[PDB]
Amino acid sequence: ITLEELRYISVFHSITGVTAYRCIVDEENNRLIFLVSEGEAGRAIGRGGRLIKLLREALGKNIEVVEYSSDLERIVKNLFPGVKIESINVRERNGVKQVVIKVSEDDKGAAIGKGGKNVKRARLVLSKLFGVEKVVIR
Template structure:
């Protein structure tokens, strides 16, 4: 497993998520560039973190003044990629080394390509941050 250090701010956000929702956060990433916080929650806790009709996420968004992303954590790369790009159907995941860089090739169902990329590339951006942190992946290509 990767050795990750959390800042005091990230730990406060994780505690706030747990207090408000009851969901346990495994990790928290503050993306100041895009004014958002990405929570990786325990498997099975995403629904609890989001809340009925997104109520918990909306409350957190108002409290923090930032966009909130919630992803279920997974121990293996393929499951984590599927969680990051949900609800898009992932057909295959492959990692290749090119010029000393790790490139992740994600094959999605053609009808789900837009869902996988997300509005304005949002899903790919979140996936890039999370996968860089855990698997040192430099680039993501969606096919």
């Protein structure tokens, strides 16, 4: 937790009143991803996403909220809302963790997202939270 992330987390609570466990910085897309407790996402977003907007203005970046979970399958389902997750497989060899997410043939496209947008955000998040160095949609 860098001092920068610390600030981000501080402002998150000051604006929304909700506590952010972690804030994953995504410079490649000028985006901050706040991790909140189960069932707290709606409170963090606010009526009409008004809090998301105030945070964007306060922090100068696009804001995203995801509910944290120590359970991998759960947080994966949270990371891919628009898709149905059938199963996940964590393959570890020599300390290298790889995660294979199983979706339906049809849902496959939406899983990865355009430009792999979705698979990339997850890889970013699982990397910082679970040591996963690679995510794959199957």
